[PDB]
């Protein structure tokens, strides 16, 4: 089949069926074939989960047209001090990775068309948070467990990106009341879901008032572990005409009985109230409102890519073809 | 039912782990690792500052926590 005139489309078609290690060895000619291999049509969905990345190895792969880069729980700390070109990756996933801050800056300072990011449990820095404001097309930003950014960087990030559908700014320690106030007084009005959870002594009723007034189109709202909600903030959620999955879990100041008050809202579908409903009264509360799924759906689907009971390997509905098996 | 392990003081970190009673261990995420709002939901009751950092594949039922010191 090999020739000096074999059609490029035909051998691209035969290449498309090859797996990743076989493709790495698809460079039979050690010459002409080498080029037809690194074609952008091949590297389009890289499922390089786990494993490891050498210096300028992830950069080279990202250079040749990769758009879905699933690289969670990986070790890519080795510095990449080499010139690159703007990557076109549009669906990244570096959840819980062990990347170094310097190389994180080096890589992330090139992606400008991103629209799906997930940096869960990673240590960031100001330059990195600022450079995330140069790609406004983000519709999903996951940021749980992060730390290391000042209030100004968060303000810039949340003011420049004005299209976010789902934000998961949860449990980001090294947060002061100023951080929460900036994150709530600057979040985009177009958001439909938010996860401002884990801020016990920083969330006050004024912040909730600002959130409900500014953003009217929420569909989910998870203010988990908010010890300063008392019993007068239900009229705040009554102003939300589209809220569907409010989860006021572990709010100790909330009285149990007045949870019945939350049954008046028509749009409400589920209500995770774990930690504050005592035994026995939970059954009565469920019986009172048969239309609510009290105490279900333990985990959060808010901007998390791989949500599912079964082991899944598609990030936000995108399944990769090139995988490391 | 649940068991809480002792602290394995490391440099710049302090660890522990918790084993579930297998009636909650089937309610464990296998793709992502949970947060202080989701493992407090299962029933784990520890102090403030414990974060899940790795899930051991041979034993999915054991949760591993670390904490800055």
């Amino acid at each position: 089949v090999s020739w000096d005139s074999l059609p490029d489309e035909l051998l691209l078609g035969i290449f498309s069926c090859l797996c990743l290690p076989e493709l790495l060895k698809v460079s039979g000619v050690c010459k002409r074939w080498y080029r037809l291999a690194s074609d952008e049509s091949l590297w389009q969905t890289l499922d390089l989960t786990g494993k490891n990345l050498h210096p300028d190895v992830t950069g080279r792969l990202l250079s040749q047209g990769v758009i879905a880069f699933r690289c969670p729980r990986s070790f890519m700390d080795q510095p990449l001090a080499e010139h690159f070109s703007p990557f076109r990756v549009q669906h990244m996933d570096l959840s819980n990775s062990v990347i170094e801050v310097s190389t994180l800056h080096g890589i992330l300072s090139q992606c400008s068309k991103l629209q799906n990011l997930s940096l869960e449990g990673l240590r960031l820095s100001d330059p990195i948070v600022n450079t995330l404001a140069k790609n406004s097309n983000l519709v999903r930003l996951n940021l749980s467990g992060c730390s290391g950014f000042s209030e100004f960087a968060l303000q810039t990030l949340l003011s420049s990106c004005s299209r976010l559908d789902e934000l998961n700014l949860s449990w980001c320690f090294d947060f002061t009341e100023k951080h929460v106030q900036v994150a709530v007084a600057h979040v985009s009005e177009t958001i439909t879901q938010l996860n401002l959870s884990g801020y016990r002594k920083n969330l006050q009723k004024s912040d909730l008032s600002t959130l409900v007034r500014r953003c009217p189109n929420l569909v989910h709202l998870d203010l988990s572990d908010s010890v300063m909600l008392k019993n007068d903030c239900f009229q705040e959620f009554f102003q939300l005409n589209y809220l569907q999955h409010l989860s006021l879990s572990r709010c100790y100041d909330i009285i149990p009985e007045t949870l019945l008050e939350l049954g008046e809202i028509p749009t409400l579908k589920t209500l995770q109230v774990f930690g504050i409903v005592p035994d026995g009264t939970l059954q009565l509360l469920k019986e009172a409102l048969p239309h609510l799924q009290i105490n279900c759906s333990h985990f959060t689907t808010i901007a998390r890519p791989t949500i599912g009971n079964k082991k899944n390997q598609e990030i936000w509905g995108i399944k990769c073809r090139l995988t490391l098996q | 039912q649940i068991y809480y392990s002792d602290k394995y003081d490391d440099e710049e970190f302090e660890y522990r782990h918790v084993m579930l009673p297998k009636d909650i261990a089937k309610l464990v995420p296998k793709t992502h690792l949970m947060s202080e709002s989701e493992w407090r939901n299962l029933g784990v009751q520890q102090s403030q500052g414990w974060v899940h950092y790795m899930i051991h594949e041979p034993e999915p039922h054991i949760l591993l926590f670390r904490r800055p010191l």
Partner: peptide
């Protein structure tokens, strides 16, 4: 609610 953020000495 009685200082729940305490490891249970059981």
């Amino acid at each position: 609610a009685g200082s729940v953020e305490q490891t249970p000495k059981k």
